[PDB]
Design a protein around this ligand. Structure first.
Ligand SMILES: [Zn+2]
Lengths: 283, 417, 220, 611
């Protein structure tokens, strides 16, 4: 990507900078101006940027991010070189594989994408990787256009002990997140943007629960549950028990099909019957 | 560049011209169309390309109008009431206080025209002018009234126009057969020196805030009566041409004279069938004076007497009160008020608009150029122009009654065998 | 303004989309005092957009029993009714064949169609479709249809303007409002459909232009 | 003392006063609060740096307040004070943003509203080399050409580059003889080290009605340098601020016969003068009865015609320009065509829509497409825009529709159902865009509309053109007594309060808002609610001498469907505004009918449709 389209889409600077509200979009402008990066080089692809700028980029960015309240900006990873022009960071292979396996447009059984993603890990197939990097882009530009919806419309309900949200089919690019695996990441980025956005002190420490429609014919939705967010969250989720006991109490129709327990398919009509009993159960 | 004045032209000759060079604080005294009077020195000028050939050039130092209408030195009631010399101001007051003034301006403006007492009045109310208003949105109401005359042959049509154009200052006179579209309104000319297209002012523009006298208005072409309507409607003149884009103001009042179709005015048809003007134009006038020469043996003695008198008394047969120089002063003074309307006069006006529509009512009679709304917006104008005349600052019933009687005699009833 | 070179010449045709990589620079042939001209010296160019196995999807489709209607059904999706007016249009896209008798007296190889009737905008759709789905095609309501002879400002003399029917080589030309076209132009289109070539003999112009196209006209 | 006995030009050029001025400007740049304790030149410089703009605005009045001596030195010798202020603002910014050197390394300070607004004809020789503020329309603009700024040649006999001379905009720079081989000859520029700068020349001229009272309008030249170029287009109304600089020309001397110099305004600041929160609008739209409340907000003066008010309001916001998925290109523009006897405020309906709308243009029918034109300034034979490409997204107000010419008629129809024009003119073969809604008014033949014939007779218009209009309103006249007072009183009163002794704020911001934040949807519950009407009415009309509602009327009805999505923010098709859509699409059809058919069809439908 370009250096500009990757600041507007990392769900760690798209939260701090609040790159969904015109009032704080100028923060990005000021951050760029404080480094001497022309607004015409920052918009161009990174491999074509001038050679005189990129000398100490990875330091003049870490510095000028202290002046804005972003001190965790350098991480520890690895990188690989094959030949003349082949240079990958270990978190590009991941975002490309993770999006070859979860492409929205389906072309057969459930095990047709799995094969194409297993293929793109050997060096003899650099034409799939280099292709699975155009899906991973298309996805990341169609996530900040949803977290921009549920935060310029306030669709995060404070239903008591946990937040709550839901989606609408009419919004564009909402059939992409229909899969019950590519929905956890959207929710986990939604929580990160929210906790940074809201002014309360209670909502900033409540776990989120999200539902989006799965099947129009069966009339069912998919539901997840993510731990209370923070900087040092232990990451020990607890919804696999809550949803189980709630469907047990209401005695509705549920499916714990996956391997992780915190993802369920639920009849569109048992939504409230389930949710109220869950509210009471978690208490 | 100046051109030989009119009263000096030797007969059968084209007028010469020379270059004058204003070179000081005097640098924009003379404008185009004026009749200034320059006073400097004649010099010779070489041809600097080869520095021979010489050419004469006038090097003016002072420039002033040739005949000042007010000999003091050359814009509200007080600025002008300052320049009024003692006799001037004791005469203007005397007139403004005069009663029956509205009958001593007619008898003193057109002294050699027997009859048509309902046309001189309209011409006067045209000269005084109404109140020009600007709506808050940005539009503008027309302030001055337009007047058209239509009649039989030899009924003193061109005589009203010649009188008005020789009396009034800054009023232009044009015929209809010998004009153009780009000559009335505004032109575009290539000055190759500057090699650019610039704007030339037309007869409707160099008569601004005055009167444009169009004789034989129905001889103009079909496309030349269109440009004049585009100006008579919005009071402006648009230009969109080679490299020019502009909008010019034109607040002239038009006095036009026309002839009925096929010589005589046929009194069994509406107006739209007796004249060949367009349809829109006939709506933008709001005062018509149809004249009919029903050969009266008693007039054919009066007119004869008057003409032979004038021709036996070259410079006499014109004795009238309020000499012509004085009326110009009174008219430059009394044209700086903005009379208002009292509530009773407003009630009177709406009642008169009620009593005018229904005369055109069905059944009993019939009339020509059916009455509409635009006749109402043209009754307040005549009342304001009547109030200006008596130097007052408000409209009274005494004015609106007369401004209604006049507009009532204007429209005639169609007839049928 | 660009400046192509040895092997970049004659690589693109007026009407193309490109992507130029050039050296923005200035003319050095040595309004204002120090003004220069500027061009882009092109040193890289691109263009934006038959097979054996593809041949078979033509073969079998030509061979299948109901080959006729399958096309005439999928050549006017929006407008419906009276497939004859769509049956005929199927042929104009293919056309007959050009024969040369021993005498060189060639024969036509195209067809002409008239769709008479009120202008109800039901036909403009069809014109647009047939123009879009044609190998070569132009839909016209400028210089004209046939050739003109116009007094050039520069030359002060008459020059020749081949209109549309000379640019459409084998293609198809669509026309609407067959009474609006200029009197001279309508005369010339009459002769052009008559002879299949346009030959103007006027002030300084005596040339011939082969008109090889198909007329799909809509009347009123 | 900062004022000694020299020339103001040469006082400031001395080292002492130069340094004093330099240090004086910094203290004002750093410390200047404005009525709230805000260092304005701390946030303003920031907002400049968040965009890479290299141009700082200095309002003159505050400079005069906080500084008494500089605001008097300034318009006397501004060719150097505006140079010193540059180096001051630089050292300020490079302190507030120490890396900004990577962005253009040079700052220009503009100056806003000197207190000496002036005319364009009153510039005399007193103002040579003095800062000046003026006004007027711009009537030309060349292209953005690059000009030398710091030239640098190279010798032809030694491969050594000569000195970096600077370029002044009066005379071509002149290099001497090579200090390395004394090879005085015709050097050529060195395109690699030379520095360039943008450049543009414009010809400004007096405003049309402002000062050009009884004379012709004068004009002047202006030169926009680097950051300013393309700040204004032919037709804009601007207000320059620039040194009034003269230079010698040899041609004028050979025409006028005297030594005469040309003049030009080196512009220093260009500020256009033209036409450029929801929480209320929420409940105001949720009134559920905004229809009546908005209808009587347009046509502010003209009484009556709440019929045509409805149609024109429908037109103003528009509809929805949906793209059909079958490649059919349905249009989303409502075109109206008034008609009626003279004297019924048609032209006023045009002129008020000129104002209330945005990006609107206007024309008469007595210039419709782009045409070749010899530029006033550049003297090149360019192509200029017509009158249907200046409404490429707004409205086009046609007047005197009848007076159009045959070429104009054959050119207007093309843009209705295609909305795209081709120009194979003497200039060059192009194909541009034109997406405008047409608002025109024709006239009745014979000086009066008479409803014995169909409307297609009294209009005097080609028949396939009337089909390209959605609404057909027919204006007429009335002699009813009770309304005579109603209209009179109104006009008379509007003449009482205009002379020198929903308001216009909600709906302008509302046509700005509601244009944007809605995207009406289309369900399929109305898809069969209409055909039950068509199957009847087609027979009802064809039975007599008429052509029933045809598809080009269903298209207009379905376009006006969304015409209320913009007023209500509803955006969902409901069986409610379908009662409105059908009602309107028949309203604009029963009137354009015959004598007894305009009433027979009424007796059927006006009672059938359950108005
Ligand atoms: Zn040398």
């Amino acid at each position: 990507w370009s250096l500009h389209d990757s600041l507007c889409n990392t769900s760690y600077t798209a939260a701090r900078f609040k790159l969904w509200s015109v009032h704080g979009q100028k923060r990005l402008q000021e951050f760029l101006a404080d480094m001497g990066l022309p607004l015409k080089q920052v918009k161009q692809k990174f491999q074509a940027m001038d050679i005189s700028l990129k000398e100490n980029l990875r330091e003049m960015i870490e510095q000028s991010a202290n002046k804005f309240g972003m001190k965790d900006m350098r991480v520890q990873t690895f990188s690989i070189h094959f030949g003349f022009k082949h240079k990958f960071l270990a978190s590009d292979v991941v975002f490309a594989t993770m999006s070859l396996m979860e492409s929205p447009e389906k072309d057969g059984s459930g095990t047709d994408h799995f094969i194409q993603a297993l293929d793109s890990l050997s060096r003899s197939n650099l034409d799939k990787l280099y292709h699975g990097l155009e899906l991973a882009k298309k996805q990341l530009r169609a996530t900040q256009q949803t977290i921009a919806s549920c935060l310029c419309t306030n669709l995060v309900i404070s239903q008591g002990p946990f937040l709550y949200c839901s989606l609408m089919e009419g919004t564009p690019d909402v059939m992409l997140f229909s899969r019950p695996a590519s929905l956890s990441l959207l929710s986990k980025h939604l929580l990160k943007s929210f906790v940074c956005s809201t002014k309360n002190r209670r909502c900033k420490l409540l776990p989120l629960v999200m539902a989006a429609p799965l099947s129009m014919e069966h009339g069912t939705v998919t539901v997840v549950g993510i731990p209370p967010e923070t900087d040092s969250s232990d990451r020990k989720n607890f919804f696999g028990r809550a949803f189980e006991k709630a469907a047990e109490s209401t005695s509705s129709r549920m499916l714990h099909n996956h391997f992780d327990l915190s993802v369920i398919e639920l009849k569109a009509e048992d939504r409230s019957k389930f949710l109220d009993a869950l509210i009471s159960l978690l208490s | 560049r100046i051109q030989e004045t009119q009263a000096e032209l030797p007969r059968g000759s084209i007028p010469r011209s020379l270059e004058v060079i204003l070179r000081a604080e005097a640098v924009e005294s003379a404008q185009a169309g004026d009749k200034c009077d320059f006073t400097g020195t004649l010099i010779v000028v070489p041809d600097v390309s080869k520095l021979l050939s010489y050419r004469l050039v006038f090097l003016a130092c002072c420039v002033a109008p040739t005949n000042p209408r007010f000999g003091g030195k050359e814009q509200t009631a007080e600025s002008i009431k300052n320049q009024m010399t003692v006799k001037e101001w004791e005469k203007v007051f005397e007139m403004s206080q005069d009663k029956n003034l509205y009958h001593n301006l007619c008898t003193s403006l057109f002294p050699t025209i027997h009859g048509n007492d309902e046309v001189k009045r309209g011409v006067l109310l045209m000269l005084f002018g109404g109140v020009p208003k600007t709506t808050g949105e940005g539009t503008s109401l027309r302030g001055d009234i337009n007047v058209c005359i239509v009649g039989d042959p030899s009924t003193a049509k061109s005589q009203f126009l010649k009188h008005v154009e020789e009396f009034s200052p800054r009023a232009v006179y044009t015929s209809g057969k010998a004009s153009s579209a780009a000559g009335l309104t505004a032109a575009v000319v290539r000055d190759e020196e500057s090699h650019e297209f610039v704007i030339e002012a037309g007869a409707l523009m160099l008569a601004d805030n005055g009167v444009c006298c169009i004789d034989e208005f129905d001889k103009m072409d079909v496309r030349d009566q269109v440009a004049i309507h585009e100006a008579m409607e919005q009071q402006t003149i648009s230009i969109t041409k080679a490299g020019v884009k502009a909008t010019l103001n034109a607040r002239t009042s038009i006095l036009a004279a026309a002839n009925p179709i096929s010589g005589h005015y046929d009194r069994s048809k509406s107006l739209k069938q007796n004249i060949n003007l367009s349809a829109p134009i006939m709506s933008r006038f709001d005062l018509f004076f149809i004249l009919v020469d029903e050969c009266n043996e008693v007039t054919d003695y009066a007119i004869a007497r008057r003409i032979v008198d004038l021709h036996s008394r070259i410079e006499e047969s014109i004795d009238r009160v309020y000499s012509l120089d004085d009326i110009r002063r009174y008219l430059l003074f009394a044209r700086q008020f903005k009379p208002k309307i009292s509530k009773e006069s407003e009630d009177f006006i709406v009642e008169q608009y009620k009593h005018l529509r229904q005369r055109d009512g069905s059944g009993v009679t019939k009339s020509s150029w059916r009455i509409t709304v635009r006749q109402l917006e043209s009754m307040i104008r005549l009342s304001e122009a009547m109030a200006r005349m008596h130097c007052c600052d408000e409209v009274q019933p005494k004015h609106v009654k007369e401004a209604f009687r006049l507009l009532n005699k204007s429209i005639i009833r169609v007839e049928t065998p | 303004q660009l400046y192509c070179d040895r092997y970049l010449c004659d690589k693109v045709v007026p009407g193309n989309r490109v992507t130029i990589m050039g050296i923005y620079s200035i003319k050095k042939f040595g309004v204002g005092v120090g003004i220069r001209s500027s061009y882009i010296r092109v040193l890289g160019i691109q263009v934006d957009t038959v097979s054996p196995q593809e041949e078979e999807e033509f073969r079998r489709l030509a061979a299948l029993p109901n080959v006729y209607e399958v096309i005439s059904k999928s050549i006017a999706p929006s407008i419906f009714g009276g497939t004859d007016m769509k049956k005929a249009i199927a042929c104009l896209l293919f056309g007959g064949s050009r024969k040369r008798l021993p005498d060189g007296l060639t024969r036509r190889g195209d067809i002409n169609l008239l769709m008479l009737g009120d202008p109800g905008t039901a036909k403009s759709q069809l014109l647009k479709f047939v123009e879009k789905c044609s190998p070569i095609g132009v839909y016209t309501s400028a210089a004209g249809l046939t050739a003109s002879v116009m007094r050039d400002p520069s030359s002060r003399n008459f020059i020749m303007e081949g209109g549309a029917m000379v640019l459409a080589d084998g293609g198809v030309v669509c026309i609407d409002e067959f009474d609006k076209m200029r009197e001279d132009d309508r005369v010339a289109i009459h002769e052009a459909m008559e002879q299949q070539t346009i030959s103007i003999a006027k002030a300084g112009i005596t040339t011939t232009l082969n008109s090889r196209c198909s007329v799909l006209a809509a009347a009123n | 003392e900062d004022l000694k006995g020299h020339s103001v030009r040469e006082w400031v050029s001395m080292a002492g006063p130069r340094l004093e001025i330099h240090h004086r400007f910094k203290n004002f740049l750093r410390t200047h609060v404005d009525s709230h304790g805000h260092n304005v030149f701390k946030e303003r410089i920031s907002d400049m740096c968040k965009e890479n703009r290299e141009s700082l605005v200095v309002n003159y009045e505050d400079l005069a307040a906080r500084e008494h001596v500089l605001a008097y030195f300034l318009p006397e010798a501004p060719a150097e004070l505006l140079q010193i202020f540059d180096e001051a603002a630089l050292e300020v910014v490079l302190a507030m943003y120490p890396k900004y050197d990577r962005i253009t390394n040079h700052i220009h300070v503009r100056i806003s509203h000197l207190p000496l607004v002036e005319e364009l004809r009153s510039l005399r020789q007193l103002h040579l080399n003095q800062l000046i503020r003026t006004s007027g329309v711009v009537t030309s603009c060349t292209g953005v050409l690059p000009q030398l700024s710091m030239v640098k040649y190279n010798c032809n006999k030694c491969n050594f580059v000569l000195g970096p001379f600077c370029q002044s905009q009066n005379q071509e720079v002149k290099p001497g003889s090579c200090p390395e081989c004394q090879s005085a000859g015709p050097f050529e520029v060195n395109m690699e080290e030379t520095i360039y700068q943008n450049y543009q020349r414009i010809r400004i001229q007096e405003s049309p009605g402002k000062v050009a009272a009884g004379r012709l309008p004068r004009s002047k030249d202006a030169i926009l340098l680097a950051d300013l170029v393309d700040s204004c287009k032919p037709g804009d109304e601007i207000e320059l601020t620039g040194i009034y600089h003269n230079n010698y020309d040899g041609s004028l001397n050979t025409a006028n016969g005297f030594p005469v110099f040309a003049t030009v305004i080196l512009a220093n600041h260009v500020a256009k003068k033209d036409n450029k929160d929801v929480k209320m609008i929420t409940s105001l739209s949720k009134d559920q009865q905004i229809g009546e409340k908005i209808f009587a907000s347009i046509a502010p003066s003209i009484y009556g015609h709440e019929d045509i008010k409805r149609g024109l309001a429908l037109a103003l916001f528009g509809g929805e320009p949906k793209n059909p998925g079958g490649k059919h290109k349905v249009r989303g523009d409502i075109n109206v065509l008034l008609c009626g006897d003279p004297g019924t405020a048609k032209s006023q309906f045009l002129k008020y829509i000129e104002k209330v709308s945005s990006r609107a243009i206007f024309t008469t029918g007595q210039g419709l497409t782009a045409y070749v034109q010899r530029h006033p300034v550049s003297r090149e034979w360019t192509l200029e825009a017509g009158a249907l490409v200046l409404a490429d997204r707004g409205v086009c107000l046609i007047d005197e529709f009848d007076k159009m010419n045959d070429q104009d008629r054959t050119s207007i129809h093309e843009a209705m159902e295609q909305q795209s024009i081709s120009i194979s003119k003497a200039g060059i073969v192009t194909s541009l865009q034109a997406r405008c809604t047409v608002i025109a008014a024709a006239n009745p033949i014979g000086g009066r509309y008479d409803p014995s014939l169909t409307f297609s007779e009294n209009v005097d218009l080609t028949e396939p053109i009337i089909s390209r209009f959605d609404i057909l309103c027919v204006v007429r006249d009335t002699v009813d007594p009770v309304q005579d007072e109603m209209l009179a009183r109104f006009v008379v009163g509007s003449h009482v309060r205009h002379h020198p002794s929903l308001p216009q704020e909600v709906l302008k911001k509302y046509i700005i808002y509601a244009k944007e934040r809605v995207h009406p949807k289309l369900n399929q519950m109305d898809q069969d609610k209409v055909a039950k009407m068509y199957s009847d009415l087609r027979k009802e009309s064809m039975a007599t001498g008429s052509i029933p509602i045809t598809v080009r009327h269903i298209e207009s009805m379905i376009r006006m469907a969304e015409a209320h999505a913009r007023i209500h923010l509803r955006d969902y098709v409901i069986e409610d505004d379908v009662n409105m859509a059908i009602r309107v699409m028949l309203e604009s059809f029963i009137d354009t009918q015959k004598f007894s058919v305009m009433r027979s069809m009424r007796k059927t439908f006006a009672r059938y449709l359950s108005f």
